[PDB]
Design a protein around this motif. Structure first.
Motif, PDB file in Angstrom:
ATOM      1  N   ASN A  49       0.975  -1.216  -0.177  1.00  0.00           N
ATOM      2  CA  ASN A  49      -0.025  -0.017   0.058  1.00  0.00           C
ATOM      3  C   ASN A  49       0.931   1.140  -0.080  1.00  0.00           C
ATOM      4  OD1 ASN A  49      -2.243  -1.555   0.233  1.00  0.00           O
ATOM      5  ND2 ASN A  49      -2.620  -1.398   2.210  1.00  0.00           N
ATOM      6  N   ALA A  50       0.123   2.270  -0.545  1.00  0.00           N
ATOM      7  CA  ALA A  50       0.981   3.501  -0.524  1.00  0.00           C
ATOM      8  C   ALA A  50       0.505   4.419   0.628  1.00  0.00           C
ATOM      9  CB  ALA A  50       0.686   4.273  -1.944  1.00  0.00           C
ATOM     10  N   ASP A  51       1.064   5.366   0.914  1.00  0.00           N
ATOM     11  CA  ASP A  51       0.798   6.204   2.159  1.00  0.00           C
ATOM     12  C   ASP A  51      -0.811   6.542   2.076  1.00  0.00           C
ATOM     13  OD1 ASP A  51       2.614   9.253   0.806  1.00  0.00           O
ATOM     14  OD2 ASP A  51       0.901   8.264  -0.103  1.00  0.00           O
ATOM     15  N   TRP A  52      -1.380   6.871   0.829  1.00  0.00           N
ATOM     16  CA  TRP A  52      -2.713   7.187   0.766  1.00  0.00           C
ATOM     17  C   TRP A  52      -3.775   6.564   1.360  1.00  0.00           C
ATOM     18  CZ3 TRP A  52      -5.781   4.976  -3.078  1.00  0.00           C
ATOM     19  CH2 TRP A  52      -5.135   4.467  -3.950  1.00  0.00           C
ATOM     20  N   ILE A  53      -3.158   5.188   1.826  1.00  0.00           N
ATOM     21  CA  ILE A  53      -4.284   4.300   2.374  1.00  0.00           C
ATOM     22  C   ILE A  53      -3.477   4.109   3.738  1.00  0.00           C
ATOM     23  CG2 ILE A  53      -5.126   1.673   2.466  1.00  0.00           C
ATOM     24  CD1 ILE A  53      -4.569   1.474  -0.367  1.00  0.00           C
ATOM     25  N   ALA A  54      -3.936   4.778   4.822  1.00  0.00           N
ATOM     26  CA  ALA A  54      -3.686   4.724   6.230  1.00  0.00           C
ATOM     27  C   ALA A  54      -2.630   3.586   6.433  1.00  0.00           C
ATOM     28  CB  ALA A  54      -4.791   4.588   7.140  1.00  0.00           C
ATOM     29  N   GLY A  55      -1.392   4.331   6.669  1.00  0.00           N
ATOM     30  CA  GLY A  55      -0.205   3.318   7.203  1.00  0.00           C
ATOM     31  C   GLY A  55       0.606   2.784   6.046  1.00  0.00           C
TER      32      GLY A  55
ATOM     33  N   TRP B 114       4.499   4.901  -2.508  1.00  0.00           N
ATOM     34  CA  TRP B 114       3.967   6.139  -3.049  1.00  0.00           C
ATOM     35  C   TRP B 114       3.293   6.022  -4.042  1.00  0.00           C
ATOM     36  CZ3 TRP B 114       6.156   7.741  -7.377  1.00  0.00           C
ATOM     37  CH2 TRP B 114       7.437   7.340  -7.782  1.00  0.00           C
ATOM     38  N   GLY B 115       2.541   6.956  -4.714  1.00  0.00           N
ATOM     39  CA  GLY B 115       1.918   6.776  -6.064  1.00  0.00           C
ATOM     40  C   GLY B 115       0.534   5.899  -6.209  1.00  0.00           C
ATOM     41  N   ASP B 116       0.294   6.041  -7.512  1.00  0.00           N
ATOM     42  CA  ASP B 116      -1.093   5.240  -7.736  1.00  0.00           C
ATOM     43  C   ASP B 116      -0.806   4.051  -8.112  1.00  0.00           C
ATOM     44  OD1 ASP B 116      -3.606   5.028  -8.268  1.00  0.00           O
ATOM     45  OD2 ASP B 116      -4.049   6.301  -9.751  1.00  0.00           O
ATOM     46  N   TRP B 117      -1.744   3.138  -7.972  1.00  0.00           N
ATOM     47  CA  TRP B 117      -1.513   1.689  -8.608  1.00  0.00           C
ATOM     48  C   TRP B 117      -0.981   1.847  -9.956  1.00  0.00           C
ATOM     49  CZ3 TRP B 117      -0.871  -1.214  -4.701  1.00  0.00           C
ATOM     50  CH2 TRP B 117      -1.501  -1.052  -3.523  1.00  0.00           C
ATOM     51  N   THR B 118      -0.334   0.677 -10.515  1.00  0.00           N
ATOM     52  CA  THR B 118      -0.037   0.599 -11.882  1.00  0.00           C
ATOM     53  C   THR B 118      -1.246   0.544 -12.840  1.00  0.00           C
ATOM     54  OG1 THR B 118       0.562  -1.791 -12.118  1.00  0.00           O
ATOM     55  CG2 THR B 118       1.987  -0.364 -10.872  1.00  0.00           C
TER      56      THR B 118
ATOM     57  N   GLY C  43     -11.796   3.275 -13.251  1.00  0.00           N
ATOM     58  CA  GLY C  43     -10.749   3.948 -12.340  1.00  0.00           C
ATOM     59  C   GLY C  43     -10.595   3.267 -10.852  1.00  0.00           C
ATOM     60  N   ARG C  44     -11.500   2.439 -10.423  1.00  0.00           N
ATOM     61  CA  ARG C  44     -11.405   1.887  -9.074  1.00  0.00           C
ATOM     62  C   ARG C  44      -9.918   1.274  -8.746  1.00  0.00           C
ATOM     63  NH1 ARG C  44     -13.079  -3.240  -5.725  1.00  0.00           N
ATOM     64  NH2 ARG C  44     -10.833  -2.882  -5.359  1.00  0.00           N
ATOM     65  N   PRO C  45      -9.510   1.462  -7.867  1.00  0.00           N
ATOM     66  CA  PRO C  45      -8.136   1.234  -7.156  1.00  0.00           C
ATOM     67  C   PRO C  45      -7.874  -0.260  -6.862  1.00  0.00           C
ATOM     68  CG  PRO C  45      -9.010   2.856  -6.096  1.00  0.00           C
ATOM     69  CD  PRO C  45     -10.155   2.366  -6.727  1.00  0.00           C
ATOM     70  N   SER C  46      -7.023  -0.669  -6.941  1.00  0.00           N
ATOM     71  CA  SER C  46      -6.474  -2.130  -6.626  1.00  0.00           C
ATOM     72  C   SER C  46      -6.957  -2.375  -5.385  1.00  0.00           C
ATOM     73  CB  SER C  46      -5.030  -2.556  -6.815  1.00  0.00           C
ATOM     74  OG  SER C  46      -4.654  -2.008  -7.995  1.00  0.00           O
ATOM     75  N   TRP C  47      -6.560  -1.478  -4.300  1.00  0.00           N
ATOM     76  CA  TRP C  47      -6.827  -1.389  -3.003  1.00  0.00           C
ATOM     77  C   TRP C  47      -7.396  -0.008  -2.590  1.00  0.00           C
ATOM     78  CZ3 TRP C  47      -2.578  -4.826  -2.645  1.00  0.00           C
ATOM     79  CH2 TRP C  47      -3.023  -6.339  -2.609  1.00  0.00           C
TER      80      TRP C  47
END
Ligand SMILES: [Ca+2]
Ligand SMILES: [Ca+2]
Ligand SMILES: [Fe+3]
Ligand SMILES: [Fe+3]
Lengths: 510, 388, 168, 388
Positions: free
Chosen positions: D58-64, D68-72, D78-82
């Motif tokens: 997980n990147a910093d925009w998902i608590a903890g 960094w950065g968006d998913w590949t 547009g739905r994120p992997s997580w």
């Protein structure tokens, strides 16, 4: 409602109250001592926790064996001399483990205090694990080794040779026949405390020096179980030290125990270590002195002093008879190589330099003899020569101590050369030392073991081997060999043509 | 150091090269089976046999032995380390026995170890799930703590009854099976105390002390004729084959199976107690584990010995009869406990059906094997004649 | 036909043992076999290499017969001779505790084995004796075990010293 | 060949010599602690934490998250992997959770394996010891085959309820606990079937087919509302925490504990049934194991989050009221099974008490942890109404 459970210690708290009094609550075995039913054991174990701590060790061991080691072909990349040496070390130690089972069962019976019984009982089980562990070492080497013969049938083929008789004394009969307490001194107080425990590790050192990673893997596991047995041995003396009889017999049974064990291992181990290997670790002199003199006879025995235990009187003497003992023994072992179930080798130039360096005067005696034997063709099956022949030609009788079963040749030995021969009620007896002579004189019906010459007398060598299945798969080639190379392996026929006929050496005296 | 000091033959370049150079180009014998000469009980040779059979250094003068000669050291007087004289039973080969479960040390501790840890988790769930709440206070403080707790010494005594056998058994296969039969027994005993120790932790006022259960055993009535049978099988018997047989195929199969299964395993439920039956499950699985071996030793092997079938079968019936009586006596003395149970807990019609189950099973699993004639009715009536 | 496990001198006794079909001479023959061929006090050493095996092959026949020709109560309390197991055990132990020395004790234990060793005496009493008899023997023997010089000890044992070699 | 053909760098003298020469004097860093940068929950970092924490990229925009950065690559649309958008709950760090039992994969399968083997031994000793003889026919053929069997689908449904969470869980430690809670449920469903398949083998005429218990489940009345609640928790909840929370801290905490423990565990022992209680022991153990993880995640990490505590509590109270109702309906209908029992098996007082036990356990182990104001009298009274 907090998650709760109960542990080994917690249950063991009341294990002592498990035993109750009644007219017949007494040992079924003859003994001279009284073990206080007030005695405790150090490790508070329950059958279940014991099972768990051992199954954990198993998982590692067998995991390494069946996986990483098998993948590294660890069963093969071992020196030829050591693959052989382990046929002896593992199976011979196996019987020690197996009789220790009966031994501790006998001691489990002798114990009155429920805790002491549990202590011994815990060992009963360990010895069973050790019996199976040593069995697995041969089993593993038989399946993945460079030479399975011997490893695959030592249990029966070991009966052809003389080295086995001696093993049985210190590791079979010594562990179970006699006052339970004397049997405890052989096994635990001396056996494991003085020899077994440190040799197990030593064996792993030599094994690794020679490419053997299998043995270290198994012996180091077994090792982990030894502090419980020594504690059992220590508690044995504590359970009787408070008894008057003890002051009247403890030291005498212990001295006999000491002599009994050292009599076999002093020569045998040194020989397996220095002659059954290519790469060395340490001269046996060094090792022996340290083990028996400073550690055992010094530190360990010193602890029981307060309990009325004195250094064995035959101690000085044991040291005297030791120096050349293993070197003296190998001459007999190689000379009688056709009676074994393994392949022996003659020291190479590097080794002979090592022996002389660490044993001044080794070359002038043993070295020259070995070279003499090799030049004559003792390694080549077409020479018709067997070193046993050299002993006859030079009038060098090889006898078997009636007590220890240890082969000795006083006319040639560079070590002890005393010899006492007696006759009693139509039978002759040969003894190699003042201590073993006494044991027979005092307890003649305890030592009636027929020696190899008595049994094989008149028989032609070749047919003794054949009857005891000393052959390899092809039914032609012998299991035992006078060298460890891949070719020119001796056959039963090469032996038959020698026309060797066993003779009882004591008969010479008429 | 990171590299260490000791050089090793398998990994050290110089040493390994010497080792490799000295190696043959093929094994010096194609037969790589460590127990090849052993006669298989099954189709193929099992790891169990290869690792066990013939580990005992017996000579041929002991049925089955492969060595030769007297022992090297004997007992004062001349008693052999091991010998034919230590057991009435005779056979063509003491190494015929085979544990149906093929249990050597490894599998053996692996199973008990799983059980130990299964047990530990069970206790943590039970306590956290507060199941103790539905347990009858009387049954707990009186029947589990006192009578069940006292049976601890019964099992314990049957365990010690194995000490001599562990020392005298005439073969490795018989020695291992035997030592396992004994170890399992002490296990149960310790398990009865484990439960009592558990209860103590979750039931304030509950004493884990053996004091109470002990006195019920030593100076009680319920287990008076019982203790006498145990003190007898243990200290009065000197024939290892008689102890193993008598205990596992007579005493424990009747008295033991009835007490464990037909009394606690059967009544504990009715009192809101799923704890005790959890341990009795182990003791029963163990019982059945042993039974398979005890049958293979005394029947398949000895009782059906190709040369001493008649002999052993006779000596066993002799023991069967010598102990069937002290057993029966220990069972009727147990009956005096049924009048301890809260009024209306169990009618005699049941006891008769359960008492008949222990006997009937005994008859199909043991007695009928050695052709020992047993009368179910006389047996049942005998123990009953002491009931309430 | 020479052998270690199978040889003529052995085939000979099974042939001989086979003729037995009465617990009478069978039991008697076992005791004789033991008197001549076992222990340091044996009458001969001509069967040294085969007595242990034959003795057992003998004990077998004596067991089978004693089982068929004995009632349950006797089979476990009466010797193959007719004697009362217990009475003997207690007598031999009575005498053993009487012995004035190791030398006497020694002869009571060894003689005991030669005579009542199963299948003659019931194993239960035999080993029960072995416990007490062995305890007495050891107690006396192990008392001042080393005080008697070998020279003197050798005369006491009464061996025919044939040779002594000692550089020290 | 004997020596082989592949050359290994650890043993081949030549290659090893090359490896040994390129080696450094000592390690290029003395910090040999993988995971050394993870905040330990206990004294020292555990193998469980090191092998697990931060495995999820997980990147910093998902608590903890530490990346960094968006998913590949994301879902069409547009739905994120997580992403945070898959759950109503918020926290300062999704990696805070710790399984109190510190179960990573190895330990987990080890324990279940012991249970498998121990179970296998149990059945063999149970069958060989002939214990079904004492089991009441009706209880076995009606209440075990039909009703206990029907409960198999309840646990199966709860298992499936964990599928979305396995894909959506915002951290490795939570994913792993979730996977294990679910996997433990499928196992129970299979054990309930293992028992039926077993009875089919030892009891002639017992049909192991699932048809009967399945028809009870899908069409009966006893489990109607239970099935309705399960179908909803499983397929109508698209939030992975509402699913896990509602399943373990509401539905299974009330209905599940009541059925397994207050009905079957409680009543089977009365009909001489030690078979079912054996498997229920596992389910209760599993239930207690999960509870610890569930409490750590929802109460210790989320409900007590230093920044979102009040928020998460409001949401969990919301969820509790949402699922308490359908759970009461589930229990209400179950009450119907009591009228099916043989006369005098149990009474209204025993049922009311067992009912109050479950609810009281639920109130202190869950409800009170989020300040859910639950009224015990009201809940039991609502359920009792179903007592036909
Ligand atoms: Ca409805
Ligand atoms: Ca009522
Ligand atoms: Fe050992
Ligand atoms: Fe040991």
């Amino acid at each position: 409602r907090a998650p709760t459970s109960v542990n080994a210690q917690e249950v063991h708290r009341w294990l002592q109250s498990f035993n109750w009094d009644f007219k017949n609550n007494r040992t079924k075995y003859a003994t001279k001592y009284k073990m206080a039913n007030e005695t405790k054991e150090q490790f508070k174990l329950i059958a279940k926790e014991y099972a768990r701590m051992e199954a954990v060790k198993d998982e590692r061991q067998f995991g390494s064996l069946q996986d990483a080691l098998t993948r590294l072909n660890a069963g093969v990349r071992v020196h030829p001399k050591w693959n052989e040496t382990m046929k002896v070390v593992s199976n011979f130690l196996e019987v020690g483990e197996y009789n220790a089972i009966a031994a501790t069962g006998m001691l489990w019976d002798s114990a009155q205090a429920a805790e002491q019984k549990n202590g011994y009982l815990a060992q009963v089980l360990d010895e069973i694990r050790h019996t199976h562990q040593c069995a697995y070492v041969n089993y593993y080497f038989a399946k993945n080794g460079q030479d399975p013969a011997g490893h695959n049938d030592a249990r029966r083929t070991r009966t052809i040779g003389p080295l086995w008789k001696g093993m049985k004394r210190v590791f079979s009969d010594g562990f179970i026949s006699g006052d339970a307490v004397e049997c405890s001194l052989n096994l635990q107080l001396v056996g494991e405390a003085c020899f077994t425990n440190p040799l197990i590790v030593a064996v792993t050192e030599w094994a690794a020096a020679n490419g053997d990673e299998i043995t270290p893997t198994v012996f180091l596991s077994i090792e982990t179980d030894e502090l419980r047995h020594m504690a059992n041995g220590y508690q044995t003396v504590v359970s009787i030290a408070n008894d008057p009889a003890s002051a009247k017999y403890l030291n005498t049974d212990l001295n006999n125990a000491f002599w009994t064990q050292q009599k076999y291992f002093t020569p045998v181990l040194g020989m397996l270590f220095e002659y059954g290997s290519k790469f060395k670790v340490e001269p046996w002199v060094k090792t022996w002195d340290r083990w028996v003199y400073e550690d055992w006879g010094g530190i360990w025995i010193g602890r029981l002093g307060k309990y009325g235990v004195e250094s064995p009187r035959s101690l000085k003497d044991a040291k005297q008879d030791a120096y050349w003992a293993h070197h003296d023994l190998y001459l007999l072992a190689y000379a009688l190589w056709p009676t074994g179930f393994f392949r022996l080798a003659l020291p190479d130039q590097e080794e002979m330099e090592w022996f002389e360096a660490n044993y001044p005067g080794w070359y002038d005696h043993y070295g020259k003899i070995y070279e003499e034997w090799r030049a004559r063709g003792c390694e080549d099956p077409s020479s018709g020569f067997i070193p046993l022949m050299w002993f006859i030609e030079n009038n060098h009788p090889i006898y078997i101590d009636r007590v220890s079963q240890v082969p000795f040749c006083p006319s040639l030995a560079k070590g002890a050369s005393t010899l006492r021969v007696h006759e009693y009620n139509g039978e002759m007896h040969t003894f190699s030392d003042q201590w073993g002579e006494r044991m027979w004189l005092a307890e003649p019906e305890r030592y009636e073991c027929q020696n190899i010459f008595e049994q094989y007398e008149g028989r032609e060598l070749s047919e003794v081997i054949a009857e005891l299945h000393g052959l390899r798969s092809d039914g032609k080639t012998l299991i035992a060999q006078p060298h460890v190379r891949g070719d020119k392996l001796w056959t039963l026929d090469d032996i038959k043509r020698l026309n060797c006929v066993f003779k009882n050496p004591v008969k010479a005296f008429n | 150091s990171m590299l260490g000091e000791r050089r090793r033959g398998l990994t050290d370049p110089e040493m390994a090269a010497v080792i490799l150079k000295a190696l043959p180009e093929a094994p010096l014998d194609g037969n790589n089976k460590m127990g090849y000469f052993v006669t298989p009980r099954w189709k193929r040779l099992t790891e169990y046999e290869a690792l066990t059979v013939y580990a005992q250094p017996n000579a041929d003068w002991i049925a089955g032995g492969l060595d030769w000669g007297d022992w090297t050291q004997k007992f004062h007087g001349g008693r052999p380390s091991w010998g034919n004289e230590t057991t009435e039973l005779r056979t063509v080969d003491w190494f015929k026995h085979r544990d149906p479960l093929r249990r050597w040390h490894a599998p053996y501790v692996k199973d008990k170890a799983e059980e130990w840890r299964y047990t530990d988790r069970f206790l943590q769930g039970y306590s956290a799930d507060g199941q103790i709440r539905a347990m009858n206070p009387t049954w707990r403080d009186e029947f589990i703590n006192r009578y069940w707790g006292a049976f601890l010494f019964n099992e314990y005594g049957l365990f010690n009854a194995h000490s001599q056998g562990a020392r005298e058994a005439l073969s490795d296969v018989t020695r291992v099976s035997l030592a396992f039969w004994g170890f399992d027994k002490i296990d149960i005993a310790q398990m009865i105390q484990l439960e009592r120790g558990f209860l103590a932790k979750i039931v304030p006022g509950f004493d884990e002390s053996t004091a109470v259960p002990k006195a019920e055993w030593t100076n009680g009535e319920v287990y008076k004729s019982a203790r006498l049978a145990v003190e007898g099988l243990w200290q009065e018997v000197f024939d290892w084959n008689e102890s193993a047989f008598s205990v596992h195929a007579v005493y424990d199969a009747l008295f033991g199976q009835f007490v464990r299964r037909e009394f606690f395993q059967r009544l504990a439920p009715r009192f809101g107690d799923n704890l005790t039956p959890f341990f009795i499950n182990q003791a029963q699985t163990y019982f059945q584990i042993a039974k398979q071996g005890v049958q293979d030793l005394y029947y398949n092997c000895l009782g059906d010995d190709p040369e001493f079938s008649d002999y052993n079968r006779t000596v066993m019936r002799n023991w069967t009869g010598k102990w069937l009586e002290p057993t029966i006596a220990a069972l009727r003395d147990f009956m005096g406990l049924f009048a301890k149970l809260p009024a209306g807990t169990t009618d005699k019609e049941e006891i008769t059906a359960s008492l008949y189950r222990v006997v009937d099973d005994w008859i199909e699993d043991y007695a009928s094997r050695i052709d020992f004639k047993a009368d179910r009715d006389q047996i049942v009536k005998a123990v009953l004649a002491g009931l309430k | 036909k020479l052998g270690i496990h199978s040889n003529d001198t052995r085939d000979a006794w099974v042939n001989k043992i086979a003729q037995l079909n009465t617990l009478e001479k069978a039991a008697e023959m076992l005791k004789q076999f033991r008197m001549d061929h076992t222990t340091p006090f044996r009458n001969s050493y001509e069967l040294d290499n085969d007595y242990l095996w034959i003795e057992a092959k003998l004990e077998e026949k004596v067991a089978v017969l004693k089982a068929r020709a004995f009632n349950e109560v006797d089979f476990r309390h009466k010797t193959a001779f007719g004697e009362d197991a217990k009475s003997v055990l207690d007598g031999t132990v009575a005498k053993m505790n009487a012995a004035k020395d190791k030398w006497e004790a020694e002869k009571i234990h060894i003689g005991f084995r030669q005579a009542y060793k199963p299948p003659i005496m019931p194993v239960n009493y035999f080993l029960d004796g072995e416990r007490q008899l062995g305890t007495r023997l050891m107690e006396l023997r192990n008392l001042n075990y080393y005080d008697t010089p070998l020279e003197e000890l050798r005369k006491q044992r009464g061996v025919r010293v044939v040779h002594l070699q000692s550089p020290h």
